[PDB]
Amino acid sequence: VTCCYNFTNRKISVQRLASYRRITSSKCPKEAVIFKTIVAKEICADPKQKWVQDSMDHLDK
Amino acid sequence: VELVQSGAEVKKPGSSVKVSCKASGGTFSSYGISWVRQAPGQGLEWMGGIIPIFGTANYAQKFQGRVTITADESTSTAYMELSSLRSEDTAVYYCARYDGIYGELDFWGQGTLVTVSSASTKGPSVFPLAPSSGTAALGCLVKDYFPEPVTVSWNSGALTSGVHTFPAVLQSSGLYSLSSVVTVPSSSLGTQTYICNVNHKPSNTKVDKKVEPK
Amino acid sequence: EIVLTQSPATLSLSPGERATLSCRASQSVSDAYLAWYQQKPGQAPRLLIYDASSRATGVPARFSGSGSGTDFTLTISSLEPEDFAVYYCHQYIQLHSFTFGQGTKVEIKRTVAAPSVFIFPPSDEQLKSGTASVVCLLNNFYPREAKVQWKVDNALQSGNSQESVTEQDSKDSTYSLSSTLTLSKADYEKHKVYACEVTHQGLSSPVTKSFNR
């Protein structure tokens, strides 16, 4: 998945998240977190959104 | 998103049944298919699901050693084979779409009826329930047929008001029985004909029964 | 492994009243991964609420869900009569093991209405078949609960009669019930007096309808 144009508007359980990668506001529309799902696919998420932060550092630990 | 399931089955106890579910797309590259059943008048039971890009299914333990759920990518059809069938397996079997990253069953198939019994496909015997001692009740006994369902109308659909078609009850013979009744004005009993129209599709039976006073 | 327990079993409310259904889980459901389904008689379940509190697609505004962990509630704010259904809860946090609640039935409450009682002897045609069914009909009554007892030669019968009850009528909110006495021609011909006796709260005294062969 290249860039993000729309964010997911539905919170995902961390149990369904394998890993994340960031994307930046350069050469690409909006800064976003891209979650790698337990089911292969990637979801765009809003880094300003709260559940995204908590998912990110849960994944880190 | 349509889920189109294969037709009703009748099986002897001890055998197996394979139910299909064709999903509209080629789009189970993003979703999975769940199988959920419901015995008559009972609740919802999960049986298992498959997310096709995993190649393998998960099963509810009540069925664990008995069920196989598969998926074929080329035709976008999911399957559910249940073996060692018993009467408790008599149920409506639904397929339902879900997202692996969530899980709510958001779209459902129309269901497949599987009837497990020793009984043989049999057309109903239809007898009149003749009115007698303001308004009168009359009807039809739809007797000893297998399997469900049966449809009943009156006067080819022209009579609908006051009509009660009771749920069929399973007899101790494994056969089904119901009555369809209607209330009408007493004064019409001599002057109007009442015919119940019974259609039992599984045995290709259509019966029309004149219901007269005596 | 997560058991969902719904209460109450049946909910009786008049139109316009508020409906509150419960789904308690044996374990904490982890990210509100809980759903509500509506099932009207002889129809496929319809998704009402997902994620415990999100109203689904094409779902009327009066439906709402809420709660988290183990306590979940479904709310129908102003009950419509077309809401006569069974409602089911469903956890989906355990992908490998989806589970459902046993279901809560929501029923329209109305004024007490006594049944009309009719008895049908076995038809000539049926006897010519070898069997005899004696049908007793309880028509348009409320509430659902009714006692039907068969008196054959004034002897109170037991377990030789099946009953069937209709779904609550969408128009008048009543129920109808049939109690059938099924026999063989010979067994039917053993006794003379066949009586159906109906007890229901809408009747001040039990109602008997009978005939003689």
The DSSP result for C65-128, as a single string, is EEEEEEEEEEEESS--GGG-EEEEEEE-S-TTS-EE---EEEEE----BPPEEEEEPPPHHHHT
Cβ distance B100 to A12 less than 8 Å, yes or no, reads: no
Nearest to B159 by CA among B127, B135, B184: B184
Cβ distance B51 to A39 less than 8 Å, yes or no, reads: yes
CA distances C72 to A41, C49, C52, Å, are 30, 11, 7
Nearest chain B CA: its distance from A16 CA (Å): 5
How many helices (H) does chain A have, and how many strands (E)?
Answer: 1, 3
Q: Does the beta carbon of B101 lie under 8 angstroms from any beta carbon of chain A?
A: yes
Mutate to test the interface with A, among B58, B101, B106 (most CBs of A within 10 A): B101
Contacts of residue C7, defined as CB under 8 A and 6 or more positions apart, other chains included, come to C21, C22, C24, C104
Q: What are the strands, taking DSSP E only, across chain A?
A: 17-23, 32-37, 42-45
Nearest to A45 by CA among C127, B64, B101: B101
Give the tokens for residue A32.
């976003």
**Looking at chain B, which residue has its C-alpha nearest residue C120?**
B129
Q: Judge contact between B199 and B205, C-beta under 8 A.
A: yes
After which residues is chain B discontinuous, taking C to N > 2.5 Å?
A: 133
Q: Does the beta carbon of B51 lie under 8 angstroms from any beta carbon of chain A?
A: yes
CB atoms within 10 A of CB C210: 13
> What is the spatial order of strands in the sheet that C175-184 belongs to?
C116-120, C131-141, C175-184, C161-165
CA distance B61 to B46: 10
**Looking at chain C, which residue has its C-alpha nearest residue A55?**
C31
For domain C1-110, the CATH class is mainly beta
Residue B42: strand, helix, or coil: coil
Nearest to B196 by CA among B148, B138, B144, B143: B138
CA distance A3 to C199: 72
The yes/no answer on whether domain B1-118 falls in CATH 2.60.40.10 is: yes
Nearest chain C CA: its distance from A26 CA (Å): 33
For chain C, give the number of residues: 213
Give the strand pairing for B91-98 and C155-156.
unpaired
CA distance B207 to B210: 10
Cβ distance C30 to A10 less than 8 Å, yes or no, reads: no
Contacts of residue C46, defined as CB under 8 A and 6 or more positions apart, other chains included, come to B108, C37, C38, C39, C40
At residue C46, φ and ψ (nearest 5 deg) are -120, 130
Give the tokens for residue B30.
């993003």
- Give, in degrees to the nearest 5, the angle at Cα B130 between B126 and B134: 140
DSSP assignment letter at C149: E
CA distance A21 to B25: 30
C 83-142: CB under 8 A from B: 88, 90, 92-93, 95-103, 116, 118, 120, 122-123, 125-126, 129, 131, 133, 135, 137, 139
Cβ distance A12 to B101 less than 8 Å, yes or no, reads: yes
Residue B11 buriedness (CB in 10 A; 0-12 / 13-18 / 19+)? middle
Amino acid sitting at position C143: P
Q: Judge contact between B147 and B10, C-beta under 8 A.
A: yes
Q: Judge contact between C87 and C106, C-beta under 8 A.
A: yes
C129 contacts on B by Cβ (under 8 Å): 125, 127
Closest Cβ–Cβ partner in B34, B130, B166 for C98: B34
CB pairs A-C closer than 8 Å:
13
Q: Residue written as tokens 């997560």?
A: C2
A37 contacts on B by Cβ (under 8 Å): 100-101
Method of determination is: X-ray
Give the tokens for residue C88.
């089911």
Task: List the end-to-end C-alpha distance of chain C, in Å, as a whole number.
Answer: 58
A13 contacts on C by Cβ (under 8 Å): 30-31, 33, 93
Q: Does the beta carbon of B34 lie under 8 angstroms from any beta carbon of chain C?
A: yes
For chain A, give the number of residues: 61
How many helices (H) does chain C have, and how many strands (E)?
Answer: 2, 18
CATH 2.60.40.10 in chain C is located at 1-110, 111-213
Looking at 3.20.20.80, 2.60.40.10, 3.40.50.300, 3.30.70.100, the CATH number of the domain C111-213 comes to 2.60.40.10
Q: Does the beta carbon of B102 lie under 8 angstroms from any beta carbon of chain A?
A: yes
Q: Judge contact between C166 and C176, C-beta under 8 A.
A: yes
At residue B71, φ and ψ (nearest 5 deg) are -145, 135
Q: Judge contact between B183 and B162, C-beta under 8 A.
A: yes
Q: Which string of b and e fits B35-50 if b means at least 16 CB within 10 Å?
A: bbbbeeeeebbbbbbb
CB atoms within 10 A of CB C213: 12
B104 contacts on C by Cβ (under 8 Å): 35, 47, 50-51, 90, 92
* Domains B1-118 and B119-214 agree in fold: yes
Q: What are B60-69's contacts with CB under 8 Å, separation 24+? A: B60/C97, B60/C98, B61/C97, B69/B33, B69/B35
For domain B119-214, the CATH class is mainly beta
CA gyration radius, chain B = 22
Nearest chain B CA: its distance from C98 CA (Å): 6
B101 contacts on A by Cβ (under 8 Å): 12-13, 16, 37-39, 41, 43
Q: Judge contact between C71 and C56, C-beta under 8 A.
A: no
| Cα–chain center distance at C126 | 30
Residue B63: strand, helix, or coil: coil
For domain A1-61, the CATH class is mainly beta
